[model samples]
Target chain A: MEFRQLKYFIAVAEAGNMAAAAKRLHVSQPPITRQMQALEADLGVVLLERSHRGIELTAAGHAFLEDARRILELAGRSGDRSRAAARGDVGELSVAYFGTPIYRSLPLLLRAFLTSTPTATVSLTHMTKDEQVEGLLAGTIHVGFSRFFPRHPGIEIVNIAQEDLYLAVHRSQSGKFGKTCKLADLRAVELTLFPRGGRPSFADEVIGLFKHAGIEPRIARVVEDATAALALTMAGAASSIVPASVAAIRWPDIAFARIVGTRVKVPISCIFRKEKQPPILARFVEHVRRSAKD
Target chain B: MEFRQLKYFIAVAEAGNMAAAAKRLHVSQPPITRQMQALEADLGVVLLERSHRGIELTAAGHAFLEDARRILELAGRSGDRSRAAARGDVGELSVAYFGTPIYRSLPLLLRAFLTSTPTATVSLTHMTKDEQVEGLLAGTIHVGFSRFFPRHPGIEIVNIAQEDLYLAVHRSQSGKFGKTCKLADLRAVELTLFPRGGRPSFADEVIGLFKHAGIEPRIARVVEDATAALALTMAGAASSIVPASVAAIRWPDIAFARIVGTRVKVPISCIFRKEKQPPILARFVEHVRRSA
Candidate 1:
């Protein structure tokens, strides 16, 4: 019934006598005799016969042999694909997203990922920073894109690049703001931040700016990302900071000012499960390092 | 995902925090926290809400908590039945038979077997001596009945009783034979034997009678049992040998003669799988030993 028994069965069925089959497989005759008896009893079918002449197969034996060979061949072929998946060459990888990679040159890195393996087998997903930490460890997500990667023994954080923080506000409300400004100067406006979903976020990073500066900005509303924050600022919903690279994409009514006064910045990082790295993500990380040099 | 996690999930769900759950269970908080994070993400459901205030179970968490306890209770209950089977207090035993056990005092032996266990849980099976030998060793049969049990490393043979050999002949063909006779004298009449299939059988035992006697009996017909061989002789088909006990139950136009000449015998034995014996069989074996 098991695969082990089938191999033993095929050899014995082919050789006719277990005496001839034993020495070839290096198995003893009695064990084959015992299992062959159980196999017949288990299925309740007489598969073979023994005579002084030798062994002969019954009608069922002939039918079972062909199917056994057919079953074994397909199992072996599918086992090949499973081995390919384990080798990190054939399957899709689950990716988790917490930050925008489009403006941060992560596309430039993934396009190189296409060169190493032409298969587009990466999944781009959106979830909380808290969720992907568990997602990475729980194996729900294979790789992650986030700024605030948490400290955990089961997580491995890889820094790809850091973008300069730019304070973006509505131009109508930007009369007092110059081309460059400080977080200490923006005390009057209510601060709007991205990622209200979970802690250890870029929102947390902005809050920590006030943690060190000995002042707390009044936070009015918090949402998900830089574009959401930038769009909200353009509509005068609230004031927000955008990644400096994102400022190149123009907004008609928004003012983008560099925070040259403070050393605070947002990092674009790749967080993944610490256990083992797949070749797809490893190659993507390689492209990241190669581009960071330029 | 595992039953191990459900217990912890229930405890955390009850205590409302990992810290409170950890102290009573004598486990550190971090592993529980890690598994809870994984459990929430694995199901893709936000089961708990954590704030500076305390932990609160969500709508799904309350539902999951109830079913988790329900699943655990039934799992533990069914696991009890499996434990009982392992203890050998329950479950049926598969018995394999070869030799005639009905008239060889085996019925009286099994009648006493009734008092020990009231449950009739044994399977009486008919198979060849060779098939049951492999059956016993390979575990298709839990126990067996036979005369010639082969000597195998995996088999344990126990002798319960030995039936003396008797010669059976048709009354028409048996006119020349007397109240007692020798197999050597019946050399002209072809011998009919039971169990035509498989080697190391009672037929082999009968052939061994001639093996030591320095003559071979002409085997005209071979069948499965004493009744079949005796039935063939009653129709004047051939002369046959049966167990001494089977002669007590007579057939019309057939004569039974005691074989005082040969020492050949058919032993009713209990052959079984030799590893750990289940109490159902262990009890049956005790009855066999007590009856012997």
Candidate 2:
């Protein structure tokens, strides 16, 4: 049945009489009867019992009435949302980012976006680089943030920030900071790295540097976060190599001597569908640029 | 937006172009555009960014697209139920029953009825005699089962069953029956009864029976359910007025005796609107008749 029929049924059920229901609905009695009859015919059930005094619902009619009313109410809300969406007063955004970005800037971005668009909702997800790439290609995620990215024709990558990578050591290790640390000096020092194995390129690049310097680097611990790495280094267990931005938080107590290498920079960028750029995508790109600097 | 617009929008949004959406919907493109434009205009938002390459949803459009789909789906289900309701495949029956019916037969009735029409959901409520009348008059309830209902105009009342209203006494008080007990003998017997002050008519009707016997009941306690009253009597708290059905379950430990000067029959019946007789109502009436 259409919404019109549901409205009519409820009106008749509530008013208790067809004539009264018709009067309330601003329809003639015959038409109300006809519609009610048609509705009954369509469903193969008698919704009402008619008497000289008034009308009453059957057991089945009463029970079905609640579901009918609920469906109609939710349909009405959906219509409102659709109308609002057509006006751009509300919208949804699907954002994918790594765990660090989620902790650092994504929440603030969401808070601001939500405050600006009260009717809009956003879904945030954390994923690895490969998953984020797959999500973008699958057209599920509208935007993403990552450090290392592969070149793909379907995705357009834009730089958001350029940060220096640092080799962080404990304050007690200040003696090793008199000069830029060479690959040989850290050959025997405990080290922490990212992604264990997913991005073999990162490990390969570090290995290439070590080989050229003619030294074998000691691997004490391989962890994910800078805080964990720093904790280990503070306890004299291992020193960590992490993004300068992440290491900056514990810079006061931690002695970070930059690695003297040509490939010391970490590039943070946003990726999106290349050919079809949604307006919101552009707006989000602007948001990230400003957020990265701050 | 109406359901029509949402249907069209989903078509186009999924198909990725107005032409494809129209072809899938079997509707003309102009009408789709007009509806889409109307929807957009009404909401004051641009949902699609159109290009010669193809149609794409804006961020706002994508977010709203799901809600639109959900609303239509929910509306569709309601429509199905409404149609089922209209066809007599499913319906609601207003049932008015005395408090005791719930303990006896209601669950069985529900189970039996549901086995026939699994989709049909029933609403059962507890109602007093006056409330049953009001419910019948207000069309809030289509069927009512009660005891000793006062007469009303244009309402059909059918006597479904009559069970013995038994006096429940502890096994120790079995001597009260003494083969036979007169009304005068019950005057000093402590008892439990349902509260009567709130409803003067019902209260008076229950109390009138005691007065007619020339006995002043020593009410030890007045409670609602016969089961709770039976529990009290079983604990040797006080004797209670209970139905024979209740005594049947707690037999041997409790003695059931007839109250003289009374018929002791509690009549149960069904009430419905007198004018319009829906087939489903008839079916329910028949069902209750057989079960009761």
Candidate 3:
């Protein structure tokens, strides 16, 4: 039942007559009487008895009056709380980011978000492309950051940054020294890979890119962070593929070349709940858009 | 400035070009460009550098971008919080009620309110007509219940209840006469005054009523509750005037009669914030209307 009916009933009850209650409520008495009658019917109890003397409360009316009043009160509070939560003024949110995004632009986005919404607390989780899709679908996280987009139902892919992918290798690898290395050149080289965490489908996409080249290279090692993979590559090990922004960072003893191929672009996107997004989440997504740079 | 402009800018920025952004935002490109330019002008910052390749963020644009995004996000979250607060799902509210209302119906209202909105924490305080007005005006309380209709700005009064005023005298005082007494007959008897416990204005109204009768009244002791005042009347110490419904409870102990010679009526209303009511509070106010 609408809490508005309670307020109307209480006003009539307080006025002792429909006409006065209408005046007090600033509405006409007919509407007030009609509302009261409707409320009585809705609640399955008679709330008022009319006489030339005035209105009197029935026993059931007295019994249910408080309940109705309270219901209305709480409903109002719930509305406010929900609106607050939508605004992200006060709430809990889980965010997952790929390891590379952690260094590139995630910090800047986080700083901007935190500065504006200080009341919101976010728990960060590191997830692979597969993990991100599963995390979003399972409702384990509100948002995710990944280089690869997850093709899942009810998930929106938002491009937050266009990062450059690079091939990290030992400076002493006395091979073809070129400005950019094509996918064909790396066909013989064993590469470090990021295993599918939560999104097996997305992982398949990455594997498909390799399969399209008709090259099945060896997987030297699997590590969570790109820095570790880069470390391995610096030790004359398998080449580690990481975002160019990550490679550009002044790593002491590492050399890198840009990846040039059909799918060489590193499209960093923020995956989020599409249909059930809270207004705050929507706003946060927008912020990411506004702050996204080359 | 306008919030929509920031939203438009974000959409365009995300799309990376005006035409693409317009298509994504479901608007024509001209309006998108207009809003973007307006926002940039308003902030005195160049947000984007147009390139044949696509839109690129300028240095100043990059710096201002984060702030714009942050503001929009906060606005959305704050709007939600405000809406939640309006419902009273979780928040603090201070309430004041008059004596008769406390006995008549407020307990039921409080009980139901607590049950439905368990998260909402509310404090109830008893106040006289004058105290209620002051409390509402001072913003010390969120709502107040009182008989007097306050005429102060920023105070919105909602009537909760109304009842006839009656005179209560000792049953023994009318011993010779079987039962009941009217206002005219109390010309010779001294009247009991409403207690002065921070409620002087109500006492003044009562005195004004007596003076209109052209009769001088003898003073009786003043007390807080109507029950206490009724006790004094039943004891044959003094007579008092109260809401008929309130006096009805103590009728067997005292002689109850309607006050005559004046159309004195009491209106109990819940006065609260007049501007920018939280959504929860708005819902609560609506709920009160519905339940009433």
Candidate 4:
């Protein structure tokens, strides 16, 4: 039968009488009764069995009622999806970030964006600064939170926050250096540095601190990134330099101590393609800016 | 922006020009151009830039296009769901069946029904004849495939098929019984039958076979159903009788032998509420009858 007939049938079944069904549908009882009669005639089966109290559904009527309700619900959901889509409220948002921001302000920024647009889904990937830049160029990632501010023709970078750097040492060495240590104290100890290959990397940044203090660090090993350097330091192989935000993680076997004499901060930047920015990425950037302020 | 504007924007984005979009939508180019201008004004963004070759979407335009396509797809899917619902193609059907039918022709009947109505989901529950009748009256179960036919005012029973009974013994004892066993050979063996408590059950039916043959069976124990009796028989405790369909699911430790000199069978029936038959149940019953 037609969808209109099914709706009328459902109204009748729920109301338990033709007159009540018509009143609910804002139509006259005679037409509703006629519609029911027409549906029964079309199906060639008696759908309803009448009693003195009220009308009851026959086997076919009950079965048809279940189907009718399901159809109505699916139709209603379809309309909802269309409306939500038109409003730009429901879609997928792909995001990429460096490891540090995951423990810093990314959660706050994401929470704010999701609070405003709950239906929007986000798929996050961890990528290096170079990889994130390439991901934006390839349209694989809509937005990236990274520490490197690279100049590219089609990409735009916005500085979100400046994060401090800390010295990470094994717990056994905490008593030797105390709560905070200067670059001069690190000269005698074995040191581990990160970003083994990339130029103008965090490794270079940490090395600049030692050169500024006129101390030659006893470099024990060079690793891939800060995470690998932290692992080496925790295993008591060598002390490492890590982002101050990493202190929030509080690894039990490792201790973070701020440099006593100098201030070193790394800029956290958001990168996106300037030519074709997705709307979700724009909303995410706004949230990140707001979260950075807080 | 409105859904219409999103659709118009998506058309222009895909076509890369207003004239092509207008042609696709069966409208003139001027109206399509004006719609895009109005949409840009409403959102306070430059959505497109015109070049000598054609047109290109701005960053904002690229973002909005994805959202617009999603909305259009959702609208299209809504229509599909409605049409499918009208065709009686999607819903849930709860079915209850006795243990025996699971090994019998139930799978064939279910496969046939699902092949025809693929979207219709079925939930199967194992139930006894009495429990199935109670479930139907309570509206908990929509249909039942049962072997026992008990009289109930609100329930209708339709005999779908008749399955033969076979003598089941432990594999260690199959050599003594041979390929087929006479009724007299069972008199000396300990026999296990089911159901344990219900009156006029398969237990009574098996005992009737012995009475008809003028031989008294050595009834060792009575269990709830054939599954339990078969389990006991396989463990080498006693010999049992089961539906011929049980042979289809060949258990390694159990052996089934046809009864000689007697034609014994159990009726497989479908049960549902006579007063209120669900459409899915009716369709299923029709399939079972056809398959049987």
TM-score of chain A of each: 0.62, 0.58, 0.57, 0.72
lDDT of 3: 0.65
Candidate 4 to truth, TM: 0.49
| Per-residue accuracy of model 1 over A44-158 as CA lDDT, tens digit each | 8988888865688889988878887888989999999777666556656566666545443444455456546565355455567778888877777777777767677877777
2 versus 4: better DockQ goes to: 2
* Model 2 DockQ class: incorrect
- What lDDT does candidate 3 reach at residue A19? 73
lDDT of 4 by residue, B65-128 (tens): 6545544543333333334445556555678887576886677667778889788877788877
- Model 3 alpha-carbon miss at residue A109, Å: 2.9
CAPRI classification of candidate 1: incorrect
Taking all chains together, each candidate's TM-score versus the true structure is 0.38, 0.44, 0.34, 0.49
lDDT of 3 by residue, A151-241 (tens): 7778888777666667677777635645678666787677786543544322344456567778675566666556567677767766767
For residues A187-218, what per-residue lDDT tens digits would candidate 4 score against the true structure?
A: 77777877775456767777887887788878
RMSD of 3: 27.7
Model 4's number of clashes is 1
User: How many angstroms is residue A131 displaced in model 3 relative to the true structure, after the best TM-score fit?
Assistant: 4.9
